[PDB]
Ligand binder design. Structure first.
Ligand SMILES: Nc1ncnc2c1ncn2[C@@H]1O[C@H](COP(=O)(O)OP(=O)(O)OP(=O)(O)O)[C@@H](O)[C@H]1O
Ligand SMILES: [Mg+2]
Length: 226
């Protein structure tokens, strides 16, 4: 009877356009501190909107959202500010060389940085147009992981990566480096769902499944979707 709960949603319904159809309807879940929740579902299902509710950017019309803590958010827009790679990753936080190194290794940036003589000190322009798609994605993830937060909201960080790079980062970063952090990972990959503490599958704004992977194996659409 000591509770470890970090995020709760109870009977949550929300509208982006207050009057039409809800973007999220009757959503219920809870995440305990240090757990990984995988959020899956087709394009447009409401996955990012769910993260937005957690961040206070979308308010419910019904229900309650409970969370107290610092959030770090890795958006679908893999964005880059003018400045160095190092400056992009640290992004206004205090510098901790041990932490910085652990994050660049876990996000598979070691080999990319170590390529130039100027290492991670070379200035990027806004957009980081001289980087590869995957470099931009990894720098964006590294930024979110470097922040010292209580809840990590990782919105499909692996979209632009090849399947081998994605596997290595999911294992080193999400599963290992962040093992004791509360994480919500938007992903529909079945291998990732296996490793999650809990799973929420959304469909057209409603909950299609919520529970453990063993509870999912016992039941489908998810096997088509993943
Ligand atoms: N800020 C917003 N204002 C108005 N409508 C929005 C907003 N954000 C999302 N929507 C709409 O709500 C629906 C759900 O969008 P959302 O971004 O949550 O989907 P998603 O599950 O993240 O999809 P994807 O996998 O494509 O990223 C979409 O039809 C989208 O057009
Ligand atoms: Mg999205």
């Amino acid at each position: 009877s000591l509770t470890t709960t970090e995020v709760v949603m109870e009977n949550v319904t929300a509208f982006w356009e207050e009057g039409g159809t809800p973007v999220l309807k009757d959503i219920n879940f809870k995440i305990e501190r240090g757990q990984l929740l995988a959020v899956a579902g087709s394009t447009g299902a409401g996955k990012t909107s769910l993260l937005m509710m957690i961040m206070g950017e979308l308010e419910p019309s019904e229900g309650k959202i409970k969370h107290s803590g610092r959030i770090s958010f890795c958006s679908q827009f893999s964005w880059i500010m003018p400045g160095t790679i190092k400056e992009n990753i640290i992004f206004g936080v205090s510098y901790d060389e041990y932490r910085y190194r652990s994050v660049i290794k876990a996000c598979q940036l070691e080999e990319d940085i170590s390529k130039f003589a100027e290492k991670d000190n070379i200035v990027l322009g806004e957009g980081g147009i001289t980087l590869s798609g995957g470099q931009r994605a990894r720098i964006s993830l590294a930024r979110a992981v470097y922040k010292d937060a209580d809840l990590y909201l990782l919105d499909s960080p692996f979209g632009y990566l090849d399947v081998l790079t994605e596997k290595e980062i999911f294992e080193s970063c999400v599963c290992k480096l962040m093992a004791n952090k509360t994480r919500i990972l938007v992903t529909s990959k079945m291998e990732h769902l296996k490793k999650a503490d809990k799973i929420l599958i959304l469909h057209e704004g409603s909950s299609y499944f919520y529970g453990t992977f063993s509870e999912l194996q016992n039941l489908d659409f998810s096997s088509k979707l993943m």
